[PDB]
Amino acid sequence: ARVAVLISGTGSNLQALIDSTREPNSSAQIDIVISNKAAVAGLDKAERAGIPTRVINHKLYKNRVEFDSAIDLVLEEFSIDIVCLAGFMRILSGPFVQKWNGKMLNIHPSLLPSFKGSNAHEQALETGVTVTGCTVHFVAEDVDAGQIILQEAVPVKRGDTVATLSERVKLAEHKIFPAALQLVASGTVQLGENGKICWV
Ligand SMILES: Nc1nc2[nH]c(CCCCc3cc(C(=O)N[C@@H](CCC(=O)O)C(=O)O)cs3)cc2c(=O)[nH]1
Ligand SMILES: NCC(=O)N[C@@H]1O[C@H](COP(=O)([O-])[O-])[C@@H](O)[C@H]1O
């Protein structure tokens, strides 16, 4: 399966996907990395790995639909089968999401359905949970509501900050994102016609 990884920043999840997809038994290959932001570290990681990069500045488009259309053009250019959102921080339009339904994965740094949104660690810390975690899910139009593929719990330690908690949770993200990608790319897991996860 041919994979695009979309990023907005550091790219530690991208690096874990690069590492995993290069193992001999990987059913996935990363053929393109797309960033909505220029000069971010994830682009360095991609180039260093010899993977093509494209920057699609969302700041240059009239609306969300036109921006997503620009992404989709690149996806078609590289004959992509599966899209991974790896620290990509844009909400995607309905039509784009529906086109890639069952073929697009996202990593989220909470145990969904808790703490949806862009500041999950802040929320977890404010709420006072002692267990948080991360989630890989299929992307549906409703943000962070798509079908869950894998999750891993991570303890919150007393005195944790966003800095220390995100660091601990990223270790788990780097485990379950590659595992989830391999499940989907191998055809082991798919989105069911009833819209529920199907383990083949
Ligand atoms: N339809 C849909 N789109 C998705 N994008 C992502 C990927 C995860 C998105 C995380 C989140 C970003 C924002 C947000 O408000 N983003 C801003 C951009 C602000 C910025 O540039 O930092 C926006 O898009 O207007 C809220 S949660 C997941 C996901 C999803 O499940 N469904
Ligand atoms: N709602 C999406 C979200 O919060 N994504 C989070 O951004 C970080 C990106 O790190 P990375 O650039 O090192 O992969 C990751 O922790 C990811 O879960």
Curated annotation (Swiss-Prot):
Site feature location: Raises pKa of active site His: 144
Top-level lineage group: Eukaryota
Location of the region described as GART domain in the Swiss-Prot/TrEMBL record: 3-200
Sequence positions that bind (6R)-10-formyltetrahydrofolate: 64, 89-92, 106, 140-144
Disulfide-bond pairs as recorded: none
Residues that, per the record, bind N(1)-(5-phospho-beta-D-ribosyl)glycinamide: 11-13, 170-173
Catalytic residue positions: 108
Family: In the N-terminal section; belongs to the GARS family.
Domain commentary: The N-terminal ATP-grasp domain carries the phosphoribosylamine--glycine ligase activity.
Function recorded in the entry: Trifunctional enzyme that catalyzes three distinct reactions as part of the 'de novo' inosine monophosphate biosynthetic pathway.
Subunit structure of this chain's protein: Homodimer.
Name assigned to this protein: Trifunctional purine biosynthetic protein adenosine-3
Organism: Homo sapiens (Human)
Gene designation: GART
Full-sequence range covered: 808 to 1007 of 1010
